Paper text:
The purified complex was vitrified and imaged by single-particle cryo-EM, yielding a 3.01 Å consensus map. An unexpected finding in the initial reconstruction and consensus map was the mobility of the TCR-γδ subunit ECDs. The strong signal for the ECDs enabled signal subtraction and local refinement to yield an ab initio reconstruction of the TCR-γδ subunit ECD heterodimer. This contrasts with the equivalent region of the αβ TCR, which, as judged by multiple cryo-EM analyses, is apparently rigidly positioned.
T cells in jawed vertebrates comprise two lineages, αβ T cells and γδ T cells, defined by the antigen receptors they express—that is, αβ and γδ T cell receptors (TCRs), respectively. Despite these differences in ligand specificity, both TCRs consist of equivalent subunits: a ligand-binding module—that is, the TCR-αβ or -γδ heterodimer—and non-covalently associated signal-transducing dimers (CD3-ζ2, -δε and -γε).
Author numbering:
A (entry chain b): 27 to 57
B (entry chain D): 1 to 137, 144 to 192, 202 to 222
C (entry chain d): 22 to 48, 56 to 74, 85 to 126
D (entry chain m): 238 to 273
E (entry chain g): 24 to 34, 39 to 138
F (entry chain f): 33 to 156
G (entry chain C): 1 to 107, 110 to 152, 161 to 200, 207 to 213
H (entry chain n): 241 to 278
The structure:
């Protein structure tokens, strides 16, 4: 189950990264 | 052992329908093709058709497409033929023969049935009319059984004691009626017909 | 002499009449592992240099797809360079 | 045919890099489009 | 076999379309139209890799009449995706999550 | 003449022989006759179809020939070579299939992005 | 379209322990797909040879098959009492499978018939009919011509003892036709016996 | 190793679809930027 | 003592025999003499190189021995075993080289990003 | 089995330097 | 028919370069190695070199590596030697000899050639004829001509081969009229032998 | 290199004979030896190769043998077309080395001395000749005496090969001198010594 779990963790890491960069840029750059 | 056992001799009328069975034993029944073969006139063999017992598909001779319908009951490993609208040409000996299931070995028939004599006739049962035959003038005497139906009849001379030099001819049909002759050379001619329940003991005297 | 190399049951080894004197490569019957790890070696007894290329991690890349992926990676990193140019 | 399988793995990596680059540039673009 | 005019036979990724005829020249047809004319001493047509999975009519003709045409039908997939539970679950996960993230970003350009 | 219809779903491959209509079709694979009473119940036969379930690559791939009843396997006007890789719930992604799913994904993405844009537009 | 399979001989004259051959003629070329079967006089048909040369399981080696194309043959040596039967050939390419007329074996020296004529009995005259009977017993060979001078004919199978044939020829009329004539005669050729009313 | 090929090709069209979604979001944002410039 | 140099490049295998300097070298495959046959042009023995084009693995592999001009095929005792794949437009690398090229892509992308931002800042 | 793990490690590197920036900016 | 043919006598001055041809026919010319082989003084045979016609590579005797250059013209299927800086020692009979392409058959020379007799030493000196008078033996001496041959017939018989002295050939004939024809110097002399 | 030699440079063998030709190499050449037949007209052909094999077109009367360093060629039923020279060539080491080759009743030389003519004395030279025809074998010494003194300079010897008719040799021995040197002496003699010698002299005066 290694490659399918790898693509699943790729999507999860993508989601965590985009959420953290949205929070970082939005709260530390105002609007 | 591998054998095919059929029904007995069967009797129908013109325009009727007849059913013949064939029990297969000694081998895997559904792994081999059945073949109905008709022997008419006493001489000519005619392959009528073939049954796949597994798939139920039957391949017919183009002459006998409407003259036969072939079924199989797989539970008892039995094949069946139904002749529909029998005529005088359908009084024949009918055979079931086992060929191979596939095209490599379906063209030759390995084992055969014993064959059933199936008769078609307009008339009905007739009691015999046996009469003796003496010379007009080793002396030959005769016994004629003319005007009876159906086959067979056994002719014995002097309650079976006189059996040397006895020629009992096979019967022949005219006007849908059988006649048969018997010859002895030397007296009581004894004729038994279980179909009409007739037992005739005709003493032979010179004319 | 001509030293035979035995390749049976996906196993490659050497079977010589005497002790095999290895000189260079992958180190009467001397084993060499399987045949899919590509053994290369020079041996001499009483000289054969075996060189196997049964590839196990080879890629069959057509030039059509690998050029399209590269040229769309170039336009991706040109767009990302077009990004931070618009940022400042 | 492990060669086609490994080529498919390599172009999966290439498409994943392309996806990462376009996700990053599109996040930057939407940050600018809400950043005047 | 050789009987019944079945002279076209099929033996790496590529495969050999072997024909049993005279070893001088083979006129090989696909779907009843002239495609190949192979000379000495080659006799095995390489249709491509089995990953390319060639399909259809292929026949050979030598000095005698043309052989019986043989169908080739390869189903070495190399593009086949499987519908297991985890695979379609990951596909729906990616579809729903990507649509949700694009919807959130599009919502954030309300202005 | 009329080509063989091979339909593969999952691990079940059905071979259809539209030539010789009506007559009983017998099947030969690797010059061994199959489609009757055998130990393998997977290799089944129909009015036209030959069905092979739990299809395996290294023994069941080969030379399939359909021939009518009475006619020889060599007397067929046809032959077929089949080598298939099968798996559970596997479909080939053809060009029409991938074009349809990518165009319906583009259409649903455009429609859903328009809807979630206009939801925020009414919330503006 | 069907293969009109024919045999050149429909009745073969042979002897005990002899070697004879039976020739079957195919109408079209049939790729050695002939079969030879043996039908005994009781009615049992059994396969002897298939694929023009292959012996079945249990057939004796005295049967052998040969031939090619449109002409095939059965060679049988050391004929026994069991082997006296009718031998059939069948093609195997295209449906329907077609048999031929068959070739019966006949087993001696030429002999004269024992001819016996019989007037109608008084019992049949009281019944109404009148049948004149002629027994041509123990004649060889089976070919005979019977002429009635003023018709049902029944032959006999070849006997295992005398190796000959017998024929019964009966002519049946009404009483008025029988009383219309006084002299009756039947004649066999291949000996004249007659009576008077 | 066939199963890894199946997941690899399924991920190939999955990531091509995700690329198409990012491309069309880039297209809408490019139209928005072009409307902003005009 | 000098080993052969085998270079497999797509549907082409190159065999070089560097032990004999400058002598005319002829090649042998499984005790069958090949190279410069004037027919079957996919195999050629130009200079020191056997260039086998469309290298059929089942029939073009096995033993390979070079010998100089004037030396017999049977008194040269330095043989090469060749066995290789012939995958078209296909080469061999492990996880290291693809990791190297993706790391190179990361490095040039980040360097270009920082350089473009710094250039636009100044 | 290895290359996808390198891509996930690269995304993890980006995520962990982003989280380090978030931690340094949240105090 | 497989045949190798060569050029003529090819009278070459010392210190010059000579071209000896060999046309090959009846077989694939590029498929067989063409050696060239030297016969010195009519008795001693020496192997001089070989050329591969397919690839153009030439392998030489180290004695003759600076005295021969082998070329190949595959269009005309002809193998050539060019002999360089040749002296009077290199007056010899040179054969083109077919051997196998590969090492299993390149040590025996199966199809040879007729031979190029490169006689090198002098211009076309006119001959001088002398009678020789005492069965009875008479003679005719042809001295001081160059090069061979002279067709010496008696009355329009032992013809001794010519020997070189100071780059002049001397021939003798034994047996009355002596007729000498020298096609190189275009000389035709008829002398009647008389006793002294 | 490897010296390749033949022990019998010339041998005598009758028509229809089986005779052997011996060849010796300096080192063992692993039976890599080929015999070649050169007819006296100039043409040469491959007789045998690998010390035992038979080339196409070569009849079975030629049979090779030998090993190590010692090799031989045996020829049976020698015909008129078999009269030729035979050559052993090593095929072991480069360069291939050949050998000198072998060439394949007791008569007397008809020694006739010949003075120069008046044409040559006007030409300035003087060639005194001696013809030695129809004699066997080839071993002969021609001694020239000027006025009873032995001379060695100016000797020119021309031998003719064996003919198919008489199977004998013809020798021409010539002395070339100046006219003033020829007039200085009076008696010129040539002597044929083989093993008995036949002498012939003339006087200039």
């Amino acid at each position: 189950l290694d490659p399918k779990l790898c693509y699943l963790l790729d999507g999860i890491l993508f989601i965590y990264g985009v959420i953290l960069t949205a929070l970082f840029l939005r709260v530390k750059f105002s609007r | 052992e591998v054998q095919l056992q059929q029904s007995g001799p069967e009797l129908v009328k013109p325009g009727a329908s007849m059913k013949i069975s064939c029990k297969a034993s000694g081998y895997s029944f559904t792994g081999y093709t059945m073949n109905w073969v008709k022997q008419s006139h006493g001489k000519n063999l005619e392959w009528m058709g073939l049954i796949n017992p597994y798939k139920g598909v039957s391949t017919y001779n183009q002459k006998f497409k409407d003259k036969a319908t072939l079924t199989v009951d797989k539970s008892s490993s039995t094949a069946y033929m139904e002749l529909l609208s029998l005529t005088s040409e359908d009084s024949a000996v009918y055979y079931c023969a086992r060929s191979g299931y596939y095209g490599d070995s379906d063209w030759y028939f390995d084992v055969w049935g014993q064959g059933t004599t199936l008769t078609v006739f307009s008339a009905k049962t007739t009691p015999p009319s046996v009469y003796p035959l003496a010379p007009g003038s080793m002396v030959t005497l005769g016994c004629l059984v003319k005007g009876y139906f159906p086959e067979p009849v056994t002719v014995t001379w002097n309650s079976g004691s006189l059996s040397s030099g006895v020629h009992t001819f096979p019967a022949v049909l005219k006007s849908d009626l059988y006649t048969l002759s018997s010859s002895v050379t030397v007296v009581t001619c004894n004729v038994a017909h279980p179909a009409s329940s007739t037992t005739v003991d005709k003493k032979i005297v010179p004319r | 002499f001509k030293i035979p190399i035995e390749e049976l049951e996906d196993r490659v080894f050497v079977n010589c009449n005497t002790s095999i004197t290895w000189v260079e490569g992958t180190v009467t019957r001397l084993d060499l592992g399987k045949r899919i790890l590509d053994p290369r070696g020079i041996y001499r007894c009483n000289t054969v240099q075996v060189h196997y290329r049964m590839c196990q991690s080879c890629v069959e890349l057509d030039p059509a797809t690998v050029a399209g992926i590269i040229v769309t990676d170039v336009i991706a990193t040109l767009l990302l360079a077009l990004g931070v140019f618009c940022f400042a | 045919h492990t060669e086609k399988v490994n080529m498919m793995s390599l172009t999966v990596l290439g498409l994943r890099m392309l996806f990462a680059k376009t996700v990053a540039v599109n996040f930057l673009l939407t940050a600018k489009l809400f950043f005047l | 076999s050789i009987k019944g005019n079945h002279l076209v036979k099929v033996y790496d990724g590529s495969v050999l379309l072997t024909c049993d005829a005279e070893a001088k020249n083979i006129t090989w047809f696909k779907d009843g139209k002239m495609i190949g004319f192979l000379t000495e001493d080659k006799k095995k047509w390489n249709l491509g890799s089995n990953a390319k999975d060639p399909r259809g009519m292929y026949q050979c003709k030598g000095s005698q009449n043309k052989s019986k045409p043989l169908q080739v039908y390869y189903r070495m997939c190399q593009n086949c995706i499987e519908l297991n539970a985890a695979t379609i679950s990951g596909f729906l996960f990616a579809e729903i999550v990507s649509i949700f993230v694009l919807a959130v970003g599009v919502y954030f350009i309300a202005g | 003449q009329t080509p063989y219809k091979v339909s593969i779903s999952g691990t079940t491959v059905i071979l259809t022989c539209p030539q010789y209509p009506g007559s009983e079709i017998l099947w030969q694979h690797n010059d061994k006759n199959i489609g009757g009473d055998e130990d393998d119940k997977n290799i089944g036969s129909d009015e036209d179809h030959l069905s092979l379930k739990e299809f395996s690559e290294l023994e069941q791939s080969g030379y399939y020939v359909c021939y009518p009843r009475g006619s020889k396997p060599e007397d067929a006007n046809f032959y077929l070579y089949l080598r298939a890789r099968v798996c559970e719930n596997c479909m080939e992604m053809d060009v029409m299939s991938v074009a349809t799913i990518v165009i319906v994904d583009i259409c649903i993405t455009g429609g859903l992005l328009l809807l979630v844009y206009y939801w925020s537009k009414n919330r503006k | 379209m069907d293969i009109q399979m024919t045999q050149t001989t429909s009745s073969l004259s042979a002897s005990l322990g002899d070697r004879v051959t039976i020739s079957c003629r195919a109408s079209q070329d049939i790729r050695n797909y002939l079969n030879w079967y043996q039908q005994k006089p009781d009615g049992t048909v059994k396969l002897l040879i298939y694929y023009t040369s292959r012996l079945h399981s249990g057939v004796p080696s005295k049967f052998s098959g040969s031939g090619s194309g449109t002409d095939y043959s059965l060679t049988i040596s050391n004929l026994e009492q069991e082997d006296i039967a009718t031998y059939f050939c069948q093609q195997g390419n295209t449906l329907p499978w077609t048999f031929a007329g068959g070739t019966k074996l006949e087993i001696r020296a030429d002999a004269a018939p024992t001819v016996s004529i019989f007037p109608p009995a008084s019992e049949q005259l009281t019944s109404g009919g009148a049948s004149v009977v002629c027994f041509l017993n123990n004649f060889y060979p089976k070919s005979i011509n019977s002429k009635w001078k003023i018709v049902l004919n029944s032959w006999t199978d070849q006997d295992s003892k005398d190796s000959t044939y017998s024929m019964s020829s009966t002519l049946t009329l009404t009483k008025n036709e029988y009383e219309r004539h006084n002299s009756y005669t039947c004649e066999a050729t291949h000996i004249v016996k007659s009576f008077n009313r | 190793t066939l199963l890894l090929q199946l997941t690899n090709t399924s991920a190939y069209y999955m990531y091509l679809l995700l690329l198409l979604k990012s491309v069309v979001y880039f297209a809408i944002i490019t139209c928005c930027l072009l409307r902003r410039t005009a």
